[PDB]
Amino acid sequence: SHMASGKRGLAWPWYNSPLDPGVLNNGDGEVVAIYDWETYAPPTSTGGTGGLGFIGMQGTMDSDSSPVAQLATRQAQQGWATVFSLNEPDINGITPAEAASWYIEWVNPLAIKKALPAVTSSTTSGQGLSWLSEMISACAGACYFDYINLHWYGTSFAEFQAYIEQAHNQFPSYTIVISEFALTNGGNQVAFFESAFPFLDGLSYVLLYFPFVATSPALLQANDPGAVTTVGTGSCLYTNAGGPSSVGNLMY
Numbered sequence: 001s002h003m004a005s006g007k008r009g010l011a012w013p014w015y016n017s018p019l020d021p022g023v024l025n026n027g028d029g030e031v032v033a034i035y036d037w038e039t040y041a042p043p044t045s046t047g048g049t050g051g052l053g054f055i056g057m058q059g060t061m062d063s064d065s066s067p068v069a070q071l072a073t074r075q076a077q078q079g080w081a082t083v084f085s086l087n088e089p090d091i092n093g094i095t096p097a098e099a100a101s102w103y104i105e106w107v108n109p110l111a112i113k114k115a116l117p118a119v120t121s122s123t124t125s126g127q128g129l130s131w132l133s134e135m136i137s138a139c140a141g142a143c144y145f146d147y148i149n150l151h152w153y154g155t156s157f158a159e160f161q162a163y164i165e166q167a168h169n170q171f172p173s174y175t176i177v178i179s180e181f182a183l184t185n186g187g188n189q190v191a192f193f194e195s196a197f198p199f200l201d202g203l204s205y206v207l208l209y210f211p212f213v214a215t216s217p218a219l220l221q222a223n224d225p226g227a228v229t230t231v232g233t234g235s236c237l238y239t240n241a242g243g244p245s246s247v248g249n250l251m252y
């Protein structure tokens, strides 16, 4: 490669104060972005983001850590070029109408690039892409957005490839961010990402992809037992020492 695809990002948890995002940015230009599911700056060992562009995220309608009253303030203080909105409202008992009304009130005013809420890969009634389609209808032309936002967790590369191709086929005029993806527990995460990266790097309609998750197994175990039961620790980009894992090595 003589010029990086430049689509890769760090999904950077709140508990990463010991870790350095610069470890996974060798400056070739494949890794360009970082988000932390919050509107405060990534907690890191350096106080910086290792040259990566931070994307603010209002992942809840309001929280002590991301007060929605401070969303506009934090964008202006930090100078984000992009903002992400609600995390998986399609499985958190938020109706498409509720999400549209909230998005217009709180996210619309940010005069930067904006992603609609990250939805799960569920096809069960009223979830996933069906939920997203219903939110865009509920928006009634009044939502300002640049990107749709996908999560995927499943059991094969074949399932993931089919999911992204179907998302593109069903929303052929929208640019896609993949803010979280990995296998569920019991597979080979390295083999999955070895297949996924070249596939995604070739898709002009994918702006950014963020493997779950840019942390160490020890920090994931300590702070997200839910992720460990669902995903396991095989998709952690860091070693327990804070170096690149075998999956981290794929980010370069």
Ligand SMILES: OC[C@H]1O[C@@H](O[C@@H]2[C@@H](O)[C@H](O[C@@H]3[C@@H](O)[C@H](O[C@@H]4[C@@H](O)[C@H](O)O[C@H](CO)[C@H]4O)O[C@H](CO)[C@H]3O)O[C@H](CO)[C@H]2O)[C@H](O)[C@@H](O)[C@@H]1O
Residues within 6 Å of the ligand: 012, 013, 014, 015, 036, 037, 038, 040, 043, 059, 064, 065, 066, 087, 213, 223, 224, 227
């Ligand atoms: O000391 C660092 C900063 O701590 C800030 O307060 C944190 C608060 O932000 C934290 O909220 C977490 C979310 O951050 C967490 O986000 C991700 C999940 O949505 C996703 O599913 O998984 C990833 C990876 O594990 C998560 O990072 O989601 C959980 C709920 O699932 C929230 O609890 O909670 C911390 C513990 O209470 C809290 O200390 C503080 O506001 C900052 O000022 C400070 O810099």
Ligand SMILES: OC[C@H]1O[C@@H](O[C@@H]2[C@@H](O)[C@H](O)O[C@H](CO)[C@H]2O)[C@H](O)[C@@H](O)[C@@H]1O
Residues within 6 Å of the ligand: 107, 108, 109, 110, 111, 112, 113, 114, 144, 145, 146
């Ligand atoms: O997300 C679409 C685009 O939103 C733009 O900001 C919007 C303004 O142009 C418009 O006049 O007002 C709405 C609501 O206040 C804003 O969201 C951004 O400036 C663009 O970067 C973005 O592509």
Ligand SMILES: [Cl-]
Residues within 6 Å of the ligand: 119, 120, 121, 122, 151, 152, 153
């Ligand atoms: Cl999912």
